C-alpha cells in the first residue's frame, strides 16, 4: 500500500504549474480507462520519498481525491533535468 493525498486543480498551464513548484507541490494527471482525465496536485516531498523505492513502479497506488480513493499505476514521470526533483507524473487507471 502506497497512499497519496491530492487536490483537484483550479488553475492550469505554464504560469499556474510553475507556481506549484515554488510552493513545494507539483502537478500530475490521472487518465485511462473510460472517464474524463483528471488534473491533480501533490506534495513534492511525500512523493519524492515514495518513488525512491522501486515498488512505486510495479505496484498499484491509491490516490485520495476529495474522499474518493482511485487505484492507479505510475505510467510516466518527468524529472527536473539536473536537481533531484519531479515536474510531473502520469497515472493510468488500473
Amino acid at each position: 500500500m502506497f497512499t497519496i493525498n491530492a487536490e483537484v486543480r483550479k488553475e492550469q498551464g505554464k504560469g499556474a504549474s510553475r507556481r506549484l513548484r515554488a510552493a513545494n507541490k507539483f502537478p500530475a494527471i490521472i487518465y485511462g480507462g473510460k472517464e474524463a482525465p483528471l488534473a491533480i496536485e501533490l506534495d513534492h516531498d511525500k512523493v519524492m520519498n515514495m518513488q525512491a523505492k522501486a515498488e512505486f513502479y510495479s505496484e498499484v497506488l491509491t490516490i485520495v481525491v476529495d474522499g474518493k480513493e482511485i487505484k492507479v499505476k505510475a505510467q510516466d514521470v518527468q524529472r527536473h533535468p539536473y536537481k533531484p526533483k519531479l515536474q510531473h507524473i502520469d497515472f493510468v487507471r488500473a
Binding site: 522501486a54 513502479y57 505510475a74 510516466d76 514521470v77 524529472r79 533535468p81 539536473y82
Partner: protein, 136 residues
Amino acid sequence: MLQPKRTKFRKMHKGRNRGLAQGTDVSFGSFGLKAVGRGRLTARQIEAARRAMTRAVKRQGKIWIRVFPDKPITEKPLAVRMGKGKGNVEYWVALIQPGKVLYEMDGVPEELAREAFKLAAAKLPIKTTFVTKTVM
C-alpha cells in the same frame, strides 16, 4: 582526441547555447556524471577526464562517453588586423547544456565510482553531479 572523420563543412557559425539537454537519463550503465552548468568541453578535456576515471578503476568496468566534439572552432593567428576571412580550425568542442550525462560506468561499486567521477570532474570546466540509474 575525438574529432569527426569527415564533415560537409570545414567551418561553422558560432551559434548560441541556450536551453536544457537531451540525453538526461543514465541508459547504458548504472552510474553517470550529469552536467549542471553550461559550456563547451574541448576534445582535450574529454580525453583528460577519461584517462582519470580509467586510471582510477584499474580497468575493471566499462566506460561510455556520451558526448562528442563535433563543432569546430577557429582562431585567428597573432596579429591579424581583423577581417581577411574566417580563421583556421584549431580545435573541436561539444556544447553542454544543464542536464547532459557525459560519462557512464558499470561493472564497479558505488564506493569506487564516486571517486572515479570526482577525479574526472577536476579536469572539466563545468559543474557536475553524480547520478545513479532510475527504474523509470
